């Protein structure tokens, strides 16, 4: 979790570094466990007949969290991408803490983070909005629209090209504050009935079966392994749906 012994992390755009080094921050003193991705996957790389794909991951578990997975990619030379969730433990009613930075030799291009909704009413839980309604609007230049598939994500959700080195550390400093509400209120968080369990259960299939329509995600996966490969890793890696 230290990251010191990531191969991608010294070659990655600033801002990924300074958004992977807060989330491992937030994790390394929580009661982890590891867990396990399928074929217990660590690093991976793939090419076809374009440029390789290289993939460093970490995953976690806690009471709270399901499973807490760290992800650092690059494509070729240009293409440095961070990709985060917390998945909450249905039973305790979190939202999702999800977090994309995508970054070429131009800069960053979209930088992505929320803490999701899995109520059925599709509104986080009143604490969070409290927290979060405090933090207050940050301005960003460069707004970017979520695709329909982003009805997912909260009124917070942040998807923004970053103009300048103060809005990537304005950026970075909101994941912070979203991950210091998170941590905080996963310690509050009583264990909640079956039925209410049951619908946070259903929120969470909802957020993942909707995140694999990212074709964007699903390209870059396809360019390195496969059409297959893709559909394997976006399904069971990256947004597995429970059950
Ligand atoms: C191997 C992993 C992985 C890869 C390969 C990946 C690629 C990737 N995700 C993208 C966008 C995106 N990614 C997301 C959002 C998210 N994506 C997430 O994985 C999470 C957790 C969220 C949100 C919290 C959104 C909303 C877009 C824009 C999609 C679109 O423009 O159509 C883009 C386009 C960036 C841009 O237009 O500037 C790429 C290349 N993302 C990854 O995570």
């Not at 990924?16 to 921050?25: N, V």
């Not at 991408?81 to 998945?87: E, G, P, S």
């Not at 598939?149 to 990537?168: A, D, H, K, M, Q």
Request: proline content about 7%; overall charge negative; some cysteine.
């Amino acid at each position: 979790l230290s990251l010191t012994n990531s191969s991608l992390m010294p070659t990655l755009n600033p801002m990924i570094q300074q958004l992977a080094l807060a989330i491992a921050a937030s994790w390394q003193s929580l009661p982890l466990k590891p867990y396990q991705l399928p074929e217990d996957l660590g690093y991976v790389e793939g090419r076809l007949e374009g440029e390789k794909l290289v993939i460093e991951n970490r995953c976690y578990q806690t009471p709270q969290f399901r499973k807490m997975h760290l992800e650092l990619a690059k494509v070729g030379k240009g293409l440095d991408i961070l990709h985060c969730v917390m998945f909450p433990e249905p039973l305790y009613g979190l939202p999702l803490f999800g977090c994309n930075i995508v970054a070429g030799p131009g800069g960053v291009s979209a930088a992505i983070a929320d803490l999701s909704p899995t109520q059925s009413d599709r509104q986080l839980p009143a604490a969070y909005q409290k927290s979060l309604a405090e933090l207050g609007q940050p301005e960003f230049e460069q707004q970017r629209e979520l695709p329909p598939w982003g009805e997912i994500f909260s009124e917070y959700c942040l998807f923004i090209r970053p103009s300048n080195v103060t809005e990537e550390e304005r950026f970075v400093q909101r994941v912070v504050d979203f991950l210091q509400i998170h941590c905080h209120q996963s310690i509050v968080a009583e264990p909640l009935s079956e039925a209410q369990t049951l619908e946070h259960r259903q929120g969470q299939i909802h957020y993942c079966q909707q995140q694999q329509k990212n074709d964007k995600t699903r390209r870059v996966l396809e360019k390195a392994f496969g059409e297959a490969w893709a559909e394997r890793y976006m399904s069971q890696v990256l947004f597995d749906v429970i059950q």
